[PDB]
Amino acid sequence: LPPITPQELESMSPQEQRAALGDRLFLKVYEIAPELAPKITGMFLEMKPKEAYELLNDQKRLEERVTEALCVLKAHQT
Amino acid sequence: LPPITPQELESMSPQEQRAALGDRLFLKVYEIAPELAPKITGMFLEMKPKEAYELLNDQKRLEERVTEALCVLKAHQ
Amino acid sequence: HHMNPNATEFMP
Amino acid sequence: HHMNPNATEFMP
């Protein structure tokens, strides 16, 4: 999956943005947390599409956000 | 410490809010994690004041957030 | 704004 | 969403 350009993203509907961002976020999350990638991707997609798009272009910040999501999920079990 | 009312909180400066919310968050976090309470309270105080205030009146979600912060600190190792 | 553990899962 | 392990400690 080639990256989405900012021009493309603003030319898409809200639901098209979600599918394109979700697909590309899922692949990156799957490399870190393959089993929980669907749920963590769903958690990311609640953010504004500009913030979700930033994660695709900042691997350090994506990895931090995956850790944050796992910790939210771990705390939810308690 | 006595609790803050929402009317008081909205009438305080940002630094007045942080000190009032911090002192109260610290006491509650200290009962759960007395050693890491300064660090965890500092992590909490990066929230918006309305979000941090909601933790003071929701003990169950406060405990969840302490667990979350401990998890983040552990992953930082 | 805090991430939601009840969020709906995403399937590609 | 904020849970920053580098945050400054709060001392009362």
Numbering used by the authors:
A (entry chain A): 482 to 559
B (entry chain C): 482 to 558
C (entry chain B), D (entry chain D): 138 to 149
Publication passage describing the model:
NMR and X-ray crystallography reveal that Leishmania has a unique type of N-terminally-extended cap-binding protein (eIF4E4) that binds via a PAM2 motif to PABP1. Exceptionally, therefore, by binding tightly to two protein ligands and to the mRNA 5′ cap4 structure, the trypanosomatid N-terminally extended form of eIF4E acts as the core molecular scaffold for the mRNA-cap-binding complex. Thus, in Leishmania, the chain of interactions 5′cap4-eIF4E4–PABP1-poly(A) bridges the mRNA 5′ and 3′ ends. Finally, the eIF4E4 N-terminal extension is an intrinsically disordered region that transitions to a partly folded form upon binding to PABP1, whereby this interaction is not modulated by poly(A) binding to PABP1.
In further work, we were able to solve the crystal structures of PABP1(J) and of PABP1(J) co-crystallized with a synthetic eIF4E4 PAM2 peptide, both to a resolution of ∼2 Å. The structure of the complex reveals how the eIF4E4 peptide binds across the three α-helical segments of the 70-residue PABC domain of PABP1 in a similar fashion to other PABC-interacting proteins. The peptide includes the PAM2 motif (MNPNATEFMP) of eIF4E4, which follows the same pattern of PAM2 motifs found in other proteins, including Paip1 and eRF3 [Φ-(P/V)-A—F-P (34)]. The eIF4E4 peptide in the crystal structure assumes an extended conformation, whereby the PAM2 motif wraps around the core KITGMFLE motif of the PABC domain of PABP1. The phenylalanine (F525) in the PABC core motif of Leishmania PABP1 (KITGMFLE) represents a variation on the MLLE motif generally found in other poly(A)-binding proteins; this residue is located on α-helix 3 and forms part of a hydrophobic pocket that interacts with M140 in the eIF4E4 sequence. A144 in eIF4E4 fits into the hydrophobic pocket formed partially by the PABP1 G523 that also sits on α-helix 3. The carbonyl oxygens of both P142 and A144 interact with the Nϵ atom of K520 at the N-terminal end of α-helix 3. It is also noteworthy that the crystal structure indicates that M148 is angled away from (and does not interact with) P519, although our NMR data reveal that the M148 backbone amide undergoes a significant change in its environment upon binding to PABP1.
